[PDB]
Ligand binder design. Sequence first.
Ligand code: EQD
Ligand code: EQD
Lengths: 216, 214
Amino acid sequence: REKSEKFAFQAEVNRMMKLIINSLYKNKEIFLRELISNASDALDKIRLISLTDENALAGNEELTVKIKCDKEKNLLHVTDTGVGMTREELVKNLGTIAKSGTSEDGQSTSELIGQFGVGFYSAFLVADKVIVTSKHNNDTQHIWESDSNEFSVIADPRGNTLGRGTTITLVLKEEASDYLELDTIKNLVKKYSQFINFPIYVWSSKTTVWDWELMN
Amino acid sequence: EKFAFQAEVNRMMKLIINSLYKNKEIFLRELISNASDALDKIRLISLTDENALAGNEELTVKIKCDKEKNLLHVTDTGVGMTREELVKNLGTIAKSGTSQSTSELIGQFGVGFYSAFLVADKVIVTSKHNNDTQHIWESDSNEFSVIADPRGNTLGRGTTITLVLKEEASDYLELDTIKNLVKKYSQFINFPIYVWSSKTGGGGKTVWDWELMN
Ligand SMILES: Oc1cc(O)c(Cl)c(CCc2nccn2Cc2ccccc2)c1Cl
Ligand SMILES: Oc1cc(O)c(Cl)c(CCc2nccn2Cc2ccccc2)c1Cl
């Protein structure tokens, strides 16, 4: 009975605070860095499952990140066609968020915090809720909402919208509405995506008509 | 408006640590663990300089309540801090009246410091390091000021953290339940933790002294 994980948990927690406060000094932009990173990792994951499964690309064939802004509603959407998440994985989340109403193995909370805690809690720099909608092969499509502390989860009323992958929805604060100005978000996505092997798109406009625009 | 960056560092630290620990009592776990670290630091130092513990030979943690004035004191005879360390503190508090190395400061001690503001409205650090004057440091997480102690070298070596508690948390001071949480969060520290409690030893007054808890 080792019981030395509450040391690695502490280390990962401390790395996490270092970076989130680091970002809060300057950019505030680390949430977007992590949003693109974790999307790419989930694209990296299912491309890597397509080399022992052949049916793996049967809910989608594209391997994309698609970012859409809802200026009016004040939402930020980052959709990918990666591996997705089963209801099981969504309730484990990053080991730290418990179901709504309770305040009373597997992969350890330590290593989840290491890869996911930074992107999760940094969202709350600019957002008030983060909503996760995701579809894995061999489970249905669910939605997951958290306030930083607790979560609830349901099956998606719209059935299977994504085919495969995840949509991260950031209910933004009004203070941070500037992040949905098409021009500030394009340059951000251009900047943080230049070393992604996958095509990353922002929903944009010409002259006036809207379509996806490749940023890398 | 005034302390915009300080207020946001506060909002974010409370949010993250409430999410991770779900227990406002974390503040006292951290109070005790950071005190144990100051003690191990001076302990290790003492294995190569024979005369390191000269300013104070005991290696303890001493917890005294003050239900009367709503103060909680945790005092360790660990390595202490220099005035320079006190003025760095965490890097996020501004020096009083002011209208990444600091990042790594929040890494090490931010949980321990900001958890104290779940439960209190002001934090006072009194410290004495080997080869430095003793100073008093105080902060409300926005501003901070540090002075030389007029009482002089009264700790000999080490640190006293003092939490001016919120009203919402006055409970933590009743000598019964404070003994419970120290017994809990310190059953596994490699240094003695004492609490100022009382007994009845003859027919007459009760007497206060150091009760041991580990
Ligand atoms: O930005 C993303 C893009 C993605 O495609 C995907 Cl799968 C994710 C989710 C990465 C993930 N896998 C397993 C656990 N977790 C962390 C997690 C789980 C539930 C809720 C919040 C975090 C993110 Cl965070
Ligand atoms: O609870 C404790 C018991 C101790 O013995 C000691 Cl040394 C500390 C302080 C740990 C520390 N070292 C260097 C910096 N800091 C953080 C800090 C510095 C000045 C003010 C507030 C925090 C704490 Cl927090």
